[PDB]
Amino acid sequence: LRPTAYGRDVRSIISQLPVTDVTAQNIQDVQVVERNMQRIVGVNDDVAGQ
Amino acid sequence: ISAPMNDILTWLFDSHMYNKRQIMNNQFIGDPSALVVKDVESKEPGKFIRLRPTAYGRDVRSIISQLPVTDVTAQNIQDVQVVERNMQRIVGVNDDVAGQ
Amino acid sequence: ISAPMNDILTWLFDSHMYNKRQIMNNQFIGDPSALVVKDVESKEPGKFIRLRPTAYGRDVRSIISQLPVTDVTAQNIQDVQVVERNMQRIVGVNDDVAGQ
Amino acid sequence: ISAPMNDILTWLFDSHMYNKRQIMNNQFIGDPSALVVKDVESKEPGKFIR
Amino acid sequence: ISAPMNDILTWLFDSHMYNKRQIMNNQFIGDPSALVVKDVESKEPGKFIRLRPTAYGRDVRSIISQLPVTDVTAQNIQDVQVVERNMQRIVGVNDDVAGQ
Amino acid sequence: MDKATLVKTIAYRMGNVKGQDTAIDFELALSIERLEGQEFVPWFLLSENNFFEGTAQENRIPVPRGFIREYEEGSLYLRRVAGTGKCLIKKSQDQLLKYEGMTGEPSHYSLTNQYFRIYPVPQEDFKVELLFYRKSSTLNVEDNPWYEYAAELLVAETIWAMLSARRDKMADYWKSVAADQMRRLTILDAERRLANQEIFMG
Amino acid sequence: NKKDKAAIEKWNKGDTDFKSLVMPYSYAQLMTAHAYMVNVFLNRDPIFQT
């Protein structure tokens, strides 16, 4: 700490901004659309089979 | 054909590596005045860092503490795995689509 | 061909090791005045570290404490594992590709 | 060929062993004045430290 | 050849055992004045330790308590296991090496 | 500032007093004497390197003349004849009784009131050096350090004393002023010392 | 190590302490290798064959 701040508490001065990606769950959605694509084309298709 | 994707992979790796380099080292933040210094700088196994008289009543935590750091770019790994699967699909060397 | 990668591995190991060297030893931070010293320095199995006369009525918990240390470079291990897999891919000695 | 590595192993072991030696013993911190002492120093199974 | 190591094992066992001897017994810390004594010293199955007349209105929880003790030398067991494996390596009677 | 300016300022700020001039000098010397007795020691009371020669078989080394304390970032150093040396280590006396009779160069010490003790009792003449704090009257400097560096603290303190005898209530005010001046002086000492210094853990 | 002489003294008195050592690993590996070689060449029935 600088001279003018000799007695301050260390915890208060610097901190890291918190960030989160809310678009990180798009993965479950990708998986659905792909299954739906297999259904139209019929190359490796869920239907016909249990 | 695969060049466009490969790059996305290099970008991911490099970003992660550059952000780790900058912040992942152990470092501490503290008030210089309250402690006797030569004591701080010793690696002996048991050592008492003696406080100078003024801080005899202060919260010890306040005097010395370690800055907290986290890498937010450490989840790029899930993303790498997706792009690689997508790469196997274009080339067709070991591919998911043929039989899932 | 693989040297560019190997070098990345060496950097990781060395960084972790140096950061460990600096902070691992177990050290305590404390107020010298409040305790009788010869007592602190004894390794006998049961020992009462007596407060000094001038501190007869103080609370014991406040006077001495151990500094907390953590290694933030201890996760470099997941990163080592990736680079090694990538190395197997260039050389092709035990390679992930060709196979599911 | 292996010498350089073996050493790293000896260093690790020795450091650990030296740090354990210094601090791992049961010890207590207390105010001498408040208690009757002979009581503290008894190993009998049930004892009231007055 | 193995004596240097065996000796390390003996030190560990002995340290743990001596530290246990010193503090294990179950002991209580309390204020003698507040309770009628003969009551404390009875092993009958249901017994009410009565507060003395001079303490008729006091709260029961405050007067007597059991000192907390822990053995910090109780983890020496993980360390014993390592040294033993290292001993099998020098002698070669039941050895980890040669085999995965 | 110097003594004449100090006396003039003390007389002026006490109410333009003119009759008393000798009492001001008396209570100006007593003010320094009182300040030297308190716990806080400024940086300008640090001495220079001093060496002591001692005969064989005496472990007791007398304390230096104006000793107040031992310099923390300092040590007692044995200077061997060749010019090399070692730094002696301080322990309590109880802790240094194992050594009686073990033989060799001195290695540890204890301070017990008026005497430094070298427990590995030397069998030949030795020589040690030390840095420590001293009372000013014993410093080897041209002018009292206090006059140059802490002049305001001095003025206030003197005024309190003089006024307290006349029973004005202004005193408490001047004691508060002196306390503030000493509080500010303590911060400088740290700053002066901690300037251009970098601290690394371990 | 310097701390070692003290430990040896404790042991003589009846007590126990830590004295330093160099880890085995490398030795074990040489010995395992020597064995492979002895078995492959020397322990055979004819040894030199034509």
XYZ file of C-alpha atoms in Angstrom:
652
model
C 0.000 0.000 0.000
C 1.248 3.524 -0.660
C 2.302 5.842 2.078
C -0.935 7.757 2.033
C -2.783 4.547 2.520
C -0.573 2.913 5.109
C -3.338 1.902 7.477
C -6.037 0.743 5.114
C -7.523 -2.756 4.982
C -6.065 -4.751 2.059
C -9.205 -6.586 1.018
C -11.139 -3.517 -0.089
C -8.899 -2.005 -2.747
C -8.784 -4.436 -5.734
C -11.208 -7.110 -7.015
C -11.971 -9.118 -10.112
C -15.121 -8.535 -12.028
C -17.384 -11.502 -12.193
C -18.521 -12.696 -15.618
C -20.721 -15.599 -16.688
C -21.862 -16.860 -20.069
C -25.554 -17.322 -20.201
C -25.308 -18.598 -23.713
C -23.450 -21.624 -22.654
C -26.474 -23.865 -22.485
C -27.145 -23.648 -26.141
C -25.594 -27.081 -26.225
C -28.735 -28.896 -25.143
C -30.554 -27.067 -27.853
C -28.023 -28.072 -30.472
C -28.583 -31.657 -29.616
C -32.271 -31.453 -30.180
C -32.042 -29.828 -33.568
C -29.624 -32.425 -34.713
C -31.990 -35.211 -33.807
C -34.700 -33.492 -35.653
C -32.407 -33.316 -38.685
C -31.826 -37.031 -38.642
C -35.549 -37.467 -38.819
C -36.153 -35.533 -41.987
C -33.301 -37.032 -43.988
C -33.451 -40.440 -42.553
C -29.744 -41.012 -42.418
C -29.433 -42.628 -38.984
C -32.994 -42.090 -37.824
C -34.643 -42.444 -34.413
C -37.968 -43.566 -35.937
C -38.704 -47.188 -37.007
C -36.986 -48.134 -33.915
C -37.771 -47.990 -30.313
C -11.693 -27.869 -46.172
C -10.852 -28.045 -42.531
C -8.906 -24.878 -42.314
C -11.622 -22.714 -41.250
C -12.336 -24.892 -38.226
C -8.746 -25.538 -37.247
C -8.277 -21.897 -36.727
C -11.105 -21.708 -34.343
C -9.251 -24.267 -32.394
C -5.967 -22.366 -32.334
C -7.752 -19.281 -31.229
C -9.310 -21.013 -28.337
C -6.046 -22.533 -27.157
C -4.073 -19.388 -27.440
C -6.500 -17.265 -25.621
C -6.595 -19.628 -22.775
C -2.881 -19.809 -22.586
C -2.374 -16.090 -22.641
C -4.850 -15.423 -19.863
C -3.222 -18.008 -17.552
C 0.145 -16.582 -18.067
C -0.886 -13.150 -16.847
C -2.614 -14.039 -13.606
C -1.670 -17.438 -12.271
C 1.201 -16.748 -9.887
C 0.932 -16.600 -6.146
C 0.989 -12.980 -4.951
C -0.005 -11.127 -1.824
C -1.331 -7.739 -0.925
C -0.350 -6.074 2.318
C 0.510 -3.134 4.587
C 4.244 -2.712 4.722
C 4.319 -0.783 7.932
C 2.893 -3.258 10.350
C 5.423 -6.044 10.163
C 9.160 -6.576 10.556
C 10.294 -7.326 6.962
C 13.226 -9.689 7.099
C 10.871 -12.096 8.774
C 8.519 -12.105 5.809
C 11.354 -13.080 3.615
C 12.379 -16.366 5.112
C 11.612 -19.839 3.945
C 12.427 -21.712 7.092
C 9.924 -24.173 8.142
C 8.514 -22.600 11.306
C 8.732 -18.892 11.586
C 6.850 -16.268 13.440
C 6.423 -13.072 11.512
C 6.549 -10.575 14.343
C 4.247 -7.643 14.210
C 5.629 -4.204 15.026
C 3.965 -2.603 18.063
C 1.308 -0.493 16.461
C -0.786 -3.305 14.980
C -0.901 -5.360 18.112
C -4.627 -5.228 18.093
C -5.450 -5.351 14.379
C -7.122 -8.228 12.615
C -4.281 -10.259 11.318
C -6.121 -10.897 8.158
C -6.173 -7.274 7.393
C -2.417 -6.915 7.560
C -1.470 -9.599 4.961
C -3.726 -11.465 2.554
C -3.481 -13.222 -0.772
C -5.230 -11.858 -3.776
C -7.804 -14.150 -5.219
C -7.550 -15.024 -8.911
C -9.654 -17.274 -11.131
C -9.439 -18.212 -14.792
C -12.688 -17.715 -16.542
C -11.218 -19.023 -19.728
C -10.773 -22.419 -18.316
C -13.987 -23.812 -19.704
C -12.904 -23.442 -23.248
C -12.312 -27.159 -23.037
C -15.934 -28.107 -23.611
C -15.891 -25.883 -26.619
C -12.769 -27.511 -27.996
C -14.461 -30.831 -27.863
C -17.363 -29.691 -29.925
C -15.291 -28.189 -32.687
C -13.287 -31.324 -32.965
C -16.383 -33.409 -33.471
C -17.518 -31.061 -36.098
C -14.151 -31.488 -37.816
C -14.523 -35.226 -37.940
C -17.771 -34.697 -39.739
C -16.448 -32.684 -42.625
C -13.438 -34.868 -43.366
C -14.989 -38.121 -42.518
C -11.968 -39.621 -40.872
C -13.555 -41.241 -37.810
C -17.023 -39.737 -38.002
C -20.050 -39.442 -35.734
C -22.720 -39.193 -38.451
C -22.352 -42.502 -40.167
C -23.739 -44.486 -37.240
C -23.879 -41.909 -34.413
C 8.460 -31.533 -35.182
C 7.334 -31.819 -31.591
C 9.725 -29.473 -29.978
C 7.517 -26.543 -30.112
C 5.040 -28.479 -27.949
C 7.509 -30.068 -25.585
C 8.701 -26.700 -24.681
C 5.251 -25.716 -23.622
C 5.268 -28.686 -21.274
C 8.529 -27.696 -19.676
C 7.230 -24.242 -19.024
C 4.260 -25.542 -17.245
C 6.169 -27.883 -14.972
C 8.702 -25.259 -14.093
C 6.216 -22.626 -13.244
C 4.360 -24.835 -10.908
C 7.473 -25.927 -9.221
C 8.855 -22.487 -8.602
C 5.620 -21.130 -7.173
C 5.517 -24.059 -4.759
C 9.016 -23.454 -3.586
C 8.260 -19.955 -2.579
C 5.243 -20.348 -0.435
C 4.781 -23.868 0.889
C 6.628 -23.876 4.198
C 4.298 -23.559 7.199
C 4.648 -20.241 8.887
C 2.867 -18.379 11.629
C 2.146 -14.691 12.150
C 1.952 -13.321 15.663
C 2.377 -10.691 18.389
C 5.656 -11.232 20.147
C 4.751 -9.380 23.275
C 1.884 -11.407 24.566
C 3.524 -14.743 25.169
C 6.473 -16.207 27.055
C 8.867 -17.230 24.228
C 10.810 -20.260 25.341
C 7.477 -21.985 25.577
C 6.737 -21.402 21.913
C 9.941 -23.071 21.042
C 9.418 -26.505 22.460
C 8.468 -29.673 20.703
C 7.361 -31.683 23.674
C 4.163 -33.426 23.279
C 1.907 -31.538 25.692
C 2.824 -28.007 26.445
C 0.976 -24.988 27.596
C 2.188 -21.791 26.035
C 1.623 -19.403 28.905
C 0.554 -15.851 28.466
C 3.016 -13.422 30.032
C 2.286 -11.560 33.192
C 1.399 -8.376 31.397
C -1.113 -10.269 29.383
C -2.620 -12.428 32.090
C -6.237 -11.745 31.240
C -6.198 -11.780 27.470
C -8.155 -14.168 25.249
C -5.891 -16.942 23.896
C -7.355 -17.207 20.418
C -6.326 -13.744 19.263
C -2.561 -13.777 19.704
C -1.089 -16.314 17.205
C -2.319 -17.677 13.844
C -1.047 -19.445 10.768
C -0.933 -17.690 7.475
C -3.057 -19.254 4.832
C -1.416 -20.172 1.529
C -2.782 -21.817 -1.608
C -1.201 -22.787 -4.908
C -3.139 -21.484 -7.808
C -0.760 -23.131 -10.187
C -1.775 -26.526 -9.102
C -4.274 -27.058 -11.872
C -1.689 -26.985 -14.551
C -2.123 -30.729 -14.519
C -5.232 -30.726 -16.681
C -3.361 -28.593 -19.119
C -0.419 -30.963 -19.206
C -2.708 -33.744 -20.171
C -4.059 -31.910 -23.133
C -0.701 -30.991 -24.567
C 0.442 -34.531 -24.308
C -2.501 -35.762 -26.309
C -1.794 -33.207 -28.895
C 1.789 -34.480 -29.051
C 0.661 -38.003 -29.730
C -1.247 -36.668 -32.672
C 1.633 -35.064 -34.481
C 4.071 -37.945 -34.103
C 1.605 -40.693 -34.360
C 3.161 -42.909 -31.759
C 0.044 -44.066 -29.903
C -2.457 -41.796 -31.607
C -6.075 -40.935 -30.804
C -6.991 -40.546 -34.498
C -7.886 -43.503 -36.791
C -9.774 -44.770 -33.921
C -12.918 -43.853 -32.222
C 20.120 -40.257 -16.995
C 17.650 -40.375 -14.189
C 19.649 -38.482 -11.683
C 18.256 -35.192 -12.339
C 14.730 -36.412 -11.650
C 15.543 -38.538 -8.637
C 16.737 -35.504 -6.870
C 13.524 -33.739 -7.392
C 11.990 -36.617 -5.619
C 14.314 -36.477 -2.623
C 13.706 -32.809 -2.299
C 10.022 -33.260 -2.168
C 10.187 -35.976 0.467
C 12.581 -34.174 2.677
C 10.732 -30.966 2.685
C 7.589 -32.658 3.657
C 9.252 -34.528 6.413
C 10.941 -31.511 7.875
C 7.778 -29.444 7.997
C 5.839 -32.198 9.822
C 8.475 -32.579 12.379
C 8.287 -28.947 13.426
C 4.561 -28.538 13.905
C 2.731 -31.800 14.383
C 2.587 -32.255 18.148
C -0.402 -31.559 20.309
C 0.050 -28.272 22.186
C -2.191 -25.815 23.959
C -2.294 -22.122 24.580
C -3.697 -20.738 27.801
C -3.927 -18.295 30.718
C -1.986 -19.653 33.639
C -3.723 -17.619 36.261
C -7.249 -18.838 35.970
C -6.866 -22.483 36.844
C -5.480 -24.647 39.637
C -2.393 -26.257 38.011
C -1.900 -29.680 39.506
C -5.292 -30.494 38.103
C -4.180 -29.753 34.562
C -1.404 -32.189 34.967
C -3.278 -35.372 35.639
C -4.057 -38.195 33.308
C -6.791 -39.846 35.275
C -9.793 -40.712 33.361
C -12.379 -38.302 34.770
C -11.100 -35.121 36.226
C -12.513 -31.724 36.802
C -10.035 -28.950 36.271
C -11.240 -26.487 38.868
C 20.399 -51.581 3.303
C 16.930 -50.883 4.617
C 17.762 -49.753 8.060
C 17.845 -46.170 7.264
C 14.187 -46.456 6.217
C 13.004 -48.723 8.986
C 14.163 -46.220 11.431
C 11.963 -43.623 9.880
C 9.036 -45.957 10.442
C 9.812 -46.424 14.096
C 9.939 -42.713 14.604
C 6.568 -42.257 13.154
C 4.891 -44.933 15.233
C 6.470 -43.711 18.410
C 5.536 -40.143 17.930
C 1.956 -40.938 17.355
C 1.811 -43.149 20.325
C 3.314 -40.706 22.753
C 1.074 -37.839 21.701
C -1.949 -40.073 22.229
C -0.866 -41.038 25.675
C -0.723 -37.500 26.811
C -4.063 -36.184 25.828
C -6.642 -38.898 25.242
C -8.284 -39.377 28.624
C -11.677 -37.659 28.884
C -11.572 -34.715 31.187
C -13.908 -31.929 32.154
C -13.300 -28.298 33.071
C -15.617 -26.594 35.516
C -16.539 -24.165 38.306
C -16.449 -25.963 41.607
C -18.646 -23.549 43.445
C -21.858 -23.836 41.547
C -22.744 -27.454 42.097
C -23.267 -29.892 44.958
C -20.240 -32.238 44.638
C -21.255 -35.671 45.816
C -23.769 -35.599 43.020
C -21.077 -35.174 40.397
C -19.403 -38.234 41.677
C -22.054 -40.834 41.132
C -22.352 -43.374 38.396
C -25.973 -44.269 38.818
C -27.934 -44.350 35.725
C -30.246 -41.359 36.152
C -29.048 -38.603 38.354
C -29.749 -34.959 38.641
C -26.728 -32.906 39.525
C -28.352 -30.212 41.613
C -27.224 -26.650 41.643
C -26.289 -25.486 45.134
C -28.419 -23.142 47.121
C -26.281 -20.148 46.335
C -26.694 -20.872 42.694
C -30.367 -21.742 42.618
C -31.281 -19.555 39.676
C -28.343 -20.048 37.365
C -28.498 -21.490 33.848
C -27.338 -25.137 33.814
C -25.473 -25.096 30.523
C -22.760 -22.677 31.606
C -21.212 -24.411 34.600
C -19.473 -27.616 33.354
C -17.991 -28.632 29.973
C -15.617 -31.138 28.459
C -12.343 -30.040 27.040
C -11.947 -30.730 23.391
C -8.892 -32.691 22.263
C -7.758 -33.864 18.835
C -4.756 -35.841 17.649
C -2.994 -34.136 14.847
C -0.557 -36.969 14.604
C -3.183 -39.344 13.508
C -2.492 -38.970 9.822
C 0.925 -40.428 10.064
C -0.718 -43.504 8.634
C -0.609 -42.304 5.044
C 3.031 -41.595 5.542
C 3.700 -45.055 6.903
C 2.254 -46.538 3.803
C 4.559 -44.649 1.550
C 7.715 -45.580 3.378
C 6.769 -49.185 3.294
C 6.376 -49.126 -0.451
C 9.699 -47.522 -0.760
C 11.156 -50.328 1.357
C 9.798 -52.969 -0.950
C 11.619 -51.255 -3.747
C 15.081 -51.406 -2.287
C 14.944 -55.025 -1.160
C 12.869 -56.313 -3.941
C 10.806 -58.676 -1.878
C 7.354 -58.016 -3.343
C 8.262 -55.060 -5.522
C 6.130 -52.521 -7.390
C 8.684 -52.188 -10.218
C 8.909 -54.632 -13.181
C 5.249 -54.524 -13.163
C 2.681 -52.052 -14.115
C 15.904 26.142 14.058
C 18.382 26.817 16.871
C 18.263 27.537 20.591
C 17.814 31.306 20.242
C 14.945 31.006 17.760
C 13.387 28.290 19.924
C 13.442 30.509 23.015
C 12.092 33.483 21.058
C 9.219 31.450 19.593
C 8.373 29.870 22.954
C 8.235 33.313 24.559
C 6.126 34.731 21.721
C 3.541 31.943 21.545
C 3.125 31.790 25.344
C 1.516 35.234 25.404
C 4.379 37.591 24.444
C 6.052 36.929 27.792
C 9.240 38.922 28.287
C 10.347 38.620 31.915
C 11.199 34.921 31.932
C 14.151 33.707 29.886
C 16.029 31.295 32.155
C 13.007 29.169 33.060
C 12.414 28.720 29.332
C 15.903 27.249 28.911
C 15.459 25.042 31.980
C 12.140 23.617 30.772
C 13.528 23.305 27.236
C 16.286 21.025 28.500
C 13.805 19.161 30.700
C 11.496 18.737 27.698
C 14.196 16.887 25.750
C 15.022 14.844 28.847
C 11.356 13.851 29.195
C 10.945 13.016 25.503
C 14.004 10.756 25.549
C 12.402 8.718 28.340
C 9.303 7.687 26.390
C 8.810 4.575 24.280
C 9.083 6.117 20.807
C 12.639 6.610 19.524
C 13.121 8.683 16.340
C 15.577 7.838 13.594
C 18.017 10.625 14.454
C 18.983 8.973 17.761
C 20.652 6.060 15.972
C 24.376 5.945 16.691
C 27.326 4.877 14.540
C 29.295 1.644 14.582
C 30.913 1.179 17.989
C 33.414 -1.530 18.895
C 34.215 -3.082 22.273
C 37.370 -4.958 23.286
C 37.253 -7.405 26.100
C 39.436 -9.606 28.177
C 39.384 -13.339 28.193
C 37.179 -15.060 30.762
C 34.638 -12.296 31.171
C 31.403 -12.984 29.428
C 29.817 -9.777 30.642
C 30.096 -6.761 28.396
C 28.793 -3.594 29.803
C 25.999 -1.747 28.032
C 27.044 1.270 25.981
C 26.693 4.622 27.701
C 23.409 6.041 26.479
C 21.751 2.835 25.451
C 18.051 3.070 25.027
C 17.415 0.112 22.752
C 19.068 -2.185 20.226
C 18.632 -1.378 16.545
C 16.189 -3.915 15.124
C 17.626 -4.016 11.637
C 21.037 -4.224 13.260
C 23.091 -6.924 15.011
C 26.028 -7.609 17.317
C 28.886 -8.680 15.124
C 32.071 -10.397 16.106
C 35.021 -9.086 14.166
C 37.740 -11.612 13.964
C 41.296 -10.461 13.583
C 41.380 -11.183 9.860
C 38.504 -8.810 9.288
C 35.854 -11.500 8.866
C 32.864 -11.801 11.159
C 29.740 -13.588 12.325
C 26.520 -12.218 13.735
C 25.793 -13.247 17.303
C 22.223 -14.471 18.144
C 19.999 -13.307 21.024
C 18.234 -15.734 23.270
C 16.974 -15.613 26.857
C 19.290 -16.621 29.652
C 17.511 -19.740 30.649
C 17.896 -20.852 27.096
C 21.651 -20.325 27.129
C 22.741 -22.390 30.053
C 23.475 -25.542 28.087
C 26.495 -23.817 26.750
C 28.396 -23.308 29.947
C 31.730 -24.904 29.345
C 31.282 -25.900 25.711
C 34.213 -24.213 24.091
C 34.807 -21.962 21.096
C 34.159 -18.597 19.516
C 31.241 -16.736 20.904
C 27.944 -17.499 19.201
C 24.924 -16.245 21.226
C 23.940 -13.600 23.741
C 21.529 -12.364 26.352
C 20.729 -8.922 27.730
C 20.098 -8.869 31.389
C 19.708 -5.273 32.686
C 23.097 -3.730 32.367
C 25.076 -6.506 30.803
C 25.536 -8.293 27.489
C 26.580 -11.903 28.096
C 28.559 -14.077 25.681
C 27.832 -17.575 26.942
C 30.310 -19.529 24.790
C 32.892 -17.985 27.126
C 35.870 -16.823 25.032
C 39.317 -18.043 26.054
C 41.043 -15.153 24.246
C 40.536 -11.430 23.712
C 37.714 -10.578 21.310
C 36.034 -7.601 19.645
C 32.372 -6.897 18.866
C 30.437 -4.144 17.092
C 26.900 -2.855 17.600
C 24.403 -0.288 16.335
C 21.962 1.054 18.912
C 19.883 4.055 19.915
C 21.402 6.610 22.291
C 20.442 9.586 24.362
C 21.326 12.725 22.468
C 23.609 14.232 24.976
C 25.901 11.380 24.208
C 25.769 11.612 20.403
C 28.839 12.739 18.524
C 27.065 15.256 16.381
C 27.386 19.040 16.192
C 23.914 20.234 17.264
C 21.127 18.550 19.062
C 19.306 16.600 16.514
C 16.038 17.472 18.097
C 16.403 21.117 17.382
C 16.636 20.544 13.682
C 14.057 17.896 13.161
C 11.367 18.063 15.773
C 11.199 21.676 16.684
C 7.511 22.104 16.951
C 7.089 19.166 19.227
C 9.581 20.843 21.448
C 7.875 24.182 21.597
C 4.540 22.845 22.610
C 5.893 20.654 25.236
C 7.808 23.469 26.810
C 4.762 25.697 26.864
C 2.720 23.124 28.670
C 5.165 22.896 31.417
C 5.440 26.559 31.952
C 1.745 27.149 31.816
C 0.911 24.263 34.067
C 2.763 26.002 36.789
C 0.832 29.188 36.317
C -2.300 27.158 36.214
C -3.741 28.360 32.917
C -6.113 26.004 31.277
C -4.479 26.591 28.015
C -2.059 23.754 28.807
C -4.326 20.789 27.754
C -4.505 22.563 24.384
C -0.729 22.563 24.014
C -0.470 18.941 25.176
C -2.945 17.992 22.445
C -0.832 19.954 19.952
C 2.294 18.088 21.074
C 0.495 14.747 20.800
C -0.547 15.566 17.233
C 3.022 16.563 16.358
C 4.398 13.290 17.739
C 1.716 11.347 15.857
C 2.807 12.998 12.610
C 6.483 12.390 13.427
C 5.835 8.660 13.825
C 4.404 8.392 10.340
C 7.393 10.003 8.724
C 9.722 7.628 10.344
C 8.030 4.778 8.650
C 7.832 6.454 5.345
C 11.447 7.401 5.395
C 12.352 3.909 6.193
C 10.022 2.072 3.947
C 10.880 4.184 0.884
C 12.256 2.390 -2.193
C 11.936 -1.049 -0.563
C 10.352 -4.103 -2.203
C 9.134 -7.066 -0.141
C 8.978 -10.633 -1.469
C 7.410 -13.503 0.454
C 10.038 -16.130 1.211
C 22.798 -32.499 7.281
C 23.660 -30.358 10.243
C 20.515 -31.326 12.037
C 21.518 -34.970 11.822
C 24.118 -35.218 14.540
C 21.563 -34.124 17.008
C 19.196 -36.790 15.917
C 21.768 -39.477 16.297
C 22.318 -38.313 19.814
C 18.671 -38.614 20.605
C 18.616 -42.119 19.361
C 21.422 -43.093 21.626
C 19.616 -41.714 24.611
C 16.521 -43.697 23.856
C 14.432 -41.280 21.873
C 13.519 -41.129 18.219
C 13.952 -38.475 15.448
C 14.229 -37.975 11.661
C 17.435 -38.541 9.870
C 17.632 -37.838 6.132
C 17.714 -40.172 3.133
C 17.907 -40.345 -0.678
C 14.937 -41.955 -2.353
C 15.319 -45.398 -3.905
C 13.537 -45.239 -7.246
C 16.510 -45.107 -9.534
C 18.161 -48.077 -7.887
C 15.118 -50.133 -8.336
C 14.992 -49.455 -11.984
C 18.608 -50.460 -12.577
C 18.072 -53.629 -10.691
C 14.973 -54.457 -12.657
C 16.848 -53.946 -15.851
C 19.774 -56.120 -14.827
C 17.395 -58.882 -14.192
C 15.917 -58.717 -17.661
C 19.322 -59.094 -19.130
C 20.435 -61.951 -16.972
C 17.312 -63.906 -17.804
C 17.512 -63.265 -21.509
C 21.111 -64.270 -21.889
C 22.718 -66.070 -18.972
C 20.037 -68.232 -17.269
C 19.326 -70.136 -20.432
C 20.280 -73.771 -20.787
C 22.791 -73.680 -23.584
C 23.885 -69.962 -23.550
C 25.999 -70.123 -26.673
C 24.278 -71.950 -29.477
C 25.189 -72.419 -33.090
